[PDB]
From a paper:
Reverse gyrase is a bacterial/archaeal type IA DNA topoisomerase that catalyzes the ATP-dependent introduction of positive supercoils into DNA. The general architecture of reverse gyrase has become evident from crystal structures of the enzymes from Archaeoglobus fulgidus and Thermotoga maritima. Both enzymes are large (>120 kDa) monomeric entities that consist of a helicase domain containing the ATP-binding site and a type IA topoisomerase domain fused on the same poly­peptide chain. The two parts of reverse gyrase, the helicase domain and the topoisomerase domain, are structurally connected by the latch, an insertion in the helicase subdomain H2. The latch couples the activity of the helicase domain to strand passage.
It contains the catalytic tyrosine residue that acts as a nucleophile for DNA cleavage. For the convenience of biochemical studies, this residue is often mutated to phenylalanine, which renders reverse gyrase inactive but still able to bind its substrates. The corresponding cleavage-deficient variant of reverse gyrase has also been used, but no information on the structural changes associated with this mutation is available. In parallel to the structure-determination efforts of T. maritima reverse gyrase with a minimal latch, we also determined the crystal structure of the rgyr_Y851F variant. The Tyr/Phe residue at position 851 stacks on Pro660 and is further encased by the side chains of Asp668, Phe844, His852 and Arg853. In all structures the guanidinium group of Arg853 remains fixed through a charged hydrogen bond to Asp670, but the aliphatic part of Arg853 can adopt slightly different rotamers. The α-helix is present in both wild-type structures but is in a slightly different conformation in the Y851F structure. In this study, we provide evidence that the cleavage-deficient Y851F variant of T. maritima reverse gyrase shares many structural characteristics with the wild-type enzyme.
Numbering used by the authors: 2 to 1103
Write the structure that this text describes.
Amino acid sequence: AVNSKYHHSCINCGGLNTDERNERGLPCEVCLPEDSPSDIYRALLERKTLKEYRFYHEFWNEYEDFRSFFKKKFGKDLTGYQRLWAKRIVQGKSFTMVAPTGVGKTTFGMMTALWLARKGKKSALVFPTVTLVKQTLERLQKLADEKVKIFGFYSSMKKEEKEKFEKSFEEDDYHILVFSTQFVSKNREKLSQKRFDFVFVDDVDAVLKASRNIDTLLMMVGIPEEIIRKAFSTIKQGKIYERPKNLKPGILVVSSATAKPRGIRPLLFRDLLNFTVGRLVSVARNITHVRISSRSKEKLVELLEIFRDGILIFAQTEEEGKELYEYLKRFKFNVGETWSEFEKNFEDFKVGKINILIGVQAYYGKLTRGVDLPERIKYVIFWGTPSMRFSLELDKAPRFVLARVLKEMGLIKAQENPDVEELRKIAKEHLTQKEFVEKVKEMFRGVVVKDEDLELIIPDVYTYIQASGRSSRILNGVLVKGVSVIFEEDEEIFESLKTRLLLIAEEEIIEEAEANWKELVHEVEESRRRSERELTDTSRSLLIIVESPTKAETLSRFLGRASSRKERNIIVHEAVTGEGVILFTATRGHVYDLVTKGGIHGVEEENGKFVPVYNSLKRCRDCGYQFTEDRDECPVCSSKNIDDKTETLRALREISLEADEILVATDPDVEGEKISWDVTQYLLPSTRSLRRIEMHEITRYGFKKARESVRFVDFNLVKAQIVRRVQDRWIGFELSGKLQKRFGRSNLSAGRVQSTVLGWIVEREEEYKKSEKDFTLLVLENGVNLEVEGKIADDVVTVVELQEAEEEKNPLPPYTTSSALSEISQKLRLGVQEVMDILQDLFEKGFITFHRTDSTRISLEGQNVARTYLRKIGKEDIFMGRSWSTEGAHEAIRPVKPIDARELEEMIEEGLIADLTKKHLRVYELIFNRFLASQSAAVKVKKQIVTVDVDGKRMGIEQIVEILRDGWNLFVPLTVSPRFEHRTYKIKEKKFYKKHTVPLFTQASIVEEMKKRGIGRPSTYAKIVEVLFRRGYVYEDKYKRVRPTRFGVMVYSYLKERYEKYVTEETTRRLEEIMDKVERGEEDYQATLRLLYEEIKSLMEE
Ligand SMILES: [Zn+2]
Ligand SMILES: [Zn+2]
């Protein structure tokens, strides 16, 4: 409802249509001039303009024909997974059945084949075992019509039925063919020549045993052999393959894999049938982790008395597992061991004869491959933390331990490590055995180093997570609860495991006293009882539309990536959640932008109101140029390899049909709200289930609390983005157009704020030059250095006043965008834009809160991030929780996990987390330290105020002399200057120089001045600084000081000469203030466009 135009939005003719009509589902004014038609489909038919709304009307009618067919054959409605699969069947799509076991994947496959048999389409059902072939044929015969022709084949085949199947195979007088997996291998040629409309695979792993079955399956749905080899030639090369546009392949529905999809051949499905064959991911977990500080068998038996059944004890070694087994067998427990008689005691445990099963961490999962038993395992006990250990003896030290020690010492080069035995020679020829251990202790921060036993203990959080997940999974659509108890006595190992679980699984381990056992057991046993009910079905399919690929790639880490569909330009991933299925796809940036030709630089005026016209964005993948106009070739390099957002929008509408509900999860600011509306209004003519999610935190918890505050699109944020965009376009185009006539360069004005900041830099040159005053540095004996005005020839300094007070110095507030850019770029000598890129990187990778923030607010959850870190670090005494601000749409930049940069550094080297460079960790370190200081107690300090006479001038100096109690000292250093006394201090050495009191600008100080003087936004701070560098207006000298170039001075001289009242700071601040009010709904969106046009009208006149 923002009175806009979109150039490819109409759902009927694929052409231009207004924002207002798309929001109401209507096609464009050309297709349907009626504002309120009776039926849109039949209204377009009467006007003889029905073109592509026909596709959606047929899609829904054909889907509901399948739904009626399914409800007539079987007892009841489709499940949430079947609804998604049905809408992909009616579109001819191929996919993996992303769903947990026990949902009815076989039942769907039969109905799909039976439904297509009504239309005359042939299908072929494939099953791993020959028992299932006859079993499926038996169910099919009673579920099929007389006209339906079904023929089977199995190892126990009858003589008369075998020839009937083989004869009808050649005559093509069949509808459904059910045959075994071995059948495909032995009958490779006869199946490849056929073309089936539907292929159902009950078990991929059986089919994927031989690579040649992939070629057979692809040729079974009508993919030519020549295109298969051409696709394999590209995936072997490494890049992705694009299939021919006019290819009509049959449906290939396959089940999820149990084992790993090894090999590069299974990637053929991804490029020809546009779906990924991946194994199911069990990210959906409901576990309460409890830890007991002692490896005591008294509490072990007490826990087993409460649990009573479904316990899976995990010993670390076979020896101590044998010891536990003897103790438990002594207490009349029905306990089974998994080392000698594994099979008998496991199949006893599955039925219910054995209540407690004792396994060994190294080979329980290796033996149990093929049976997960979620209906039996309820409480998982861990006799000791499941950890991998390494010998710290030099002769037995692993390669990764030597890597960090020798790289810190500077002996080994940064590239690939040499032989492990070659690195062992270097360590012996430089380091002693005891020094080798002590270097590990001071560098390896994140693991556990024990000196006496010559052991390096590293908890295996991956193994803990896998063995914990055996107690909680999806049963009958219910994510059942589980309990995981760790009997770890070493606190350092427990703290190491605690932070690794938080990083990977976002789960926490409570202590024995905090756990209420009877409440946990009741939760687990009532959850299993709920699952045992019929429950009917409650699964939905949720689609999350993020804009950044980096965001979607971190969502996949806390959701799973069971499959990946290839949809035009975008990739839509799939995952299994407790609520159903979740899809998530990245938009790859903006979708729409203002055209450059219509009306006033792209904005038209109908009925006196400005209507912005948007055409889809196109990125040239070769030269990077972004353009809006519809072209075949790139306007710069004539390349036809453009990333057209028109296809991205087209894919989103096709996907929107399949999923039940859609949530546009862009960044929680005005920039992300404009993208959210552009997507939302485009999908509204195809789907009414669209809402907005605000993820300030790309995590499980940030995703959860974003959905708790679900809402619709805020048009005030949308209008605010349009006002800023139109101002930059109009001011930029007009001022650049004037500068084009004087200098000849194409793009010379990016807007009003950049010209304001440029004038600051140009006019700072004479401010700094005039401000040169003579100074003299005085070095005092037993005193600090003292800088004072020039020509000091007194040779002595006399103390006149001496005050000693005790302050409690409070810490600095947490980083906002301006604070982060100003301090991090000053400390780590980097441009503000580069710092901004690292900030955006960390936010999208789920390490810090939303970086675009103008508020120091810290949430109660965020305060607990510092408290848990201080409790781990042992300094919980110095925790002073501070909210810092009650106002703010976003809270301050802060680490979302209680993990410091050196701990993150260890995890990256170990391999737990990836994609963080050295500069990522340095920026995160500064963010972590200021945030921890902001939540740390005030440093009780003894201060001194001294009045000192220097050459007859009374100079004041204020200095800290003693720290009475440590606070945020540990995170941000606080220096203590030498104390003064009421004496005469002789001047040791005088240094005469000339220092300018008005300093030159730097990238950090420019950001500081923009915040101070009210111009700029967190979204635009670093961009404004960088554009000046990009267009050659400023440069950085030897000392990293921003100075204006000769070209930049001439350009601003022209601005101050002719158009000063538009560039002046006071007008820029006022308009930035106005646009903030438009975001809050305090100023009128159309009125401020009149305001901008009135100024622009006079800009052309001058
Ligand atoms: Zn139309
Ligand atoms: Zn190009």
